[PDB]
Structure formats: structure tokens, C-alpha cells
Structure 1
Amino acid sequence: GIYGIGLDITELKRIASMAGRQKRFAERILTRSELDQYYELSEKRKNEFLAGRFAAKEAFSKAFGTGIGRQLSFQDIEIRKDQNGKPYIICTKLSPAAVHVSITHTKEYAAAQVVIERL
């Protein structure tokens, strides 16, 4: 059946606020593979990419039922796109077959939802 579901909406402006006000924010949210892509983007695209990843990982953590913390790190979750451009999640704590995700954007927001199934 369904193990859990998660939804997150993130304001891009906030991601810009949290980002600069640190100096380690993007690197804490993104994995090595994600960072490789992130560093090639323009300032504008970087914010959209980071906001999208942040939302997807937050949604995943909610579906997981614990949120980000001691039981689950942003580094434990990686978003990729298949050959059709569809995002999917790989998480070292469960089978990718049990996970579904969707990501969307508007000028000012990034949002994502995740559904985890019990196999």
C-alpha cells in the first residue's frame, strides 16, 4: 500500500535568502552529482535548480515521515532525470521502485510531492 506522502512549496526568494546568508547552504542540500550540474548554471538557474531540489527532498522527507534530521539527510537523497526528462529519486534508505516524485515551478515558487509505497 502507501507508506507515506509528502508535499512542499518553497519560495525562491527564501532560497536566495537562506543561501547567501551562510556560505555552505547549496553544498549541504545537494549531492556531489547534483553540485556538478549546479556549478554549470547561471545565477538565475542556480536558484531555480536549488529550489527544486530543496522542495523535492523536503517532500521526500515528509513522505518518509521524519523530515530532515538525525534519521535522514539531504545527502541521503538524490534527484535525477530519466531519458524522458522525468525526475526520480534514489535514496540509500529504500528501493527506488517504491518512490514517486513530481516537481513543478512558477516564477516565484518551486514545489514537489512524493509518494512512497510499501513493497
Structure 2
Amino acid sequence: AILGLGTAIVEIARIEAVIARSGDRLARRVLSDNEWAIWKTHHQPVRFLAKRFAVKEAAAKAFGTGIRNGLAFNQFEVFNDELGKPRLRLWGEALKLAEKLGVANMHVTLADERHYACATVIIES
């Protein structure tokens, strides 16, 4: 059964503007350790960040809570499987919420165009 659904659209130029304002501080804030390692050596760091931000926002919506009760963007880790498909890995409070809700499967998709990154997340029992 579907336990939740979330979507996000991110203006890549906005992420770019935040980076101009505060350097790597947005990345330090929203990225897990594994994602941070990827960001550091990524070919297009702004685009990577915009995409990960989109998944994290969609995930928070999919859990039906948004960011609250000790949740945080850095607890929603994006990784890719061997074929390139995006996946979610949960940490701390996010992981505890998933276990409480009885989450068995987390479906993630990412898309981008020149100006926008979009993501949709479905969580399932």
C-alpha cells in the first residue's frame, strides 16, 4: 500500500544564487556525509546539489511531515544503484520515522532540464 507521495521542483538558478551568497554552506547543510563526498569532486556541483535538494524536499513531503520533530534534509541520503537509478537511504530521525510507519519500499525518480530539477518520491508498505 502507498504510505505517502511527494514532489518537488527546484529552480537551478536559485541554488546558484545561494552558492554565490554563502559558498558551500547550503551543501554542508543539506548533504549527508556520502553526498558531501560526491559534491566535492562532482563535474557539475550546482546541478548535483539542485537535484539532491529536490529529492530531499519530495521525500519530506512523502513522509507526510515535511521537516519537523528532529527531521532534517541531511537524513534523506540519495544514492544511485549500479544502473544509475536514484534511491533513498535514511539516517537518524528519518530512519526511525520510516520504521514506525512500516515503510518497506521507497521509490525515487529525478529529472532535470536546463533550468529546473524535479523529483517525485513514493513510500510503500
- What TM-score does the superposition give when structure 1 sets the normalisation length? 0.89
**2:109 corresponds to:** 102
Amino acid at match of 1:13: A
In structure 2, the partner of 1:60 is 59
Supply the distance in 1 between the matched residues of 2:7 and 2:70 (Cα, whole angstroms): 19
Per the alignment, residue 35 of structure 2 pairs with 34
Residue by residue over 1:34-69, the C-alpha shift from the partner in whole angstroms, topping out at 9 and shown as x without a partner, is 111111124xx1011000000000000001111124
In structure 2, distance between residues paired with 1:97 and 1:34: 23
Q: For 2:87 and 2:8, locate their aligned partners in 1 and report how far apart those are by CA, in whole Å.
A: 16
Q: Distance in 1 between matches of 2:69 and 2:16?
A: 25
Question: The residue matched to 2:19 in structure 1 has which SS?
Answer: helix
State the one-letter code of the partner of 1:106. E
Aligned-pair CA distance for 1:17: 1.6
Structure 1 spans left out of the alignment, 5+ residues: none
Cα distance 1:22–1:70, how it changes in 2: closer, same or farther (>3 A)? farther
Unmatched tracts of structure 2, length 5 or more: none
The alignment covers a number of residue pairs equal to 116
Tell me the TM-score normalized by structure 2: 0.85
Seq. identity, %: 39
| Higher helix proportion | 2
- Counterpart position of 1:73: 72
Q: 1:82 Cα shift?
A: 0.5
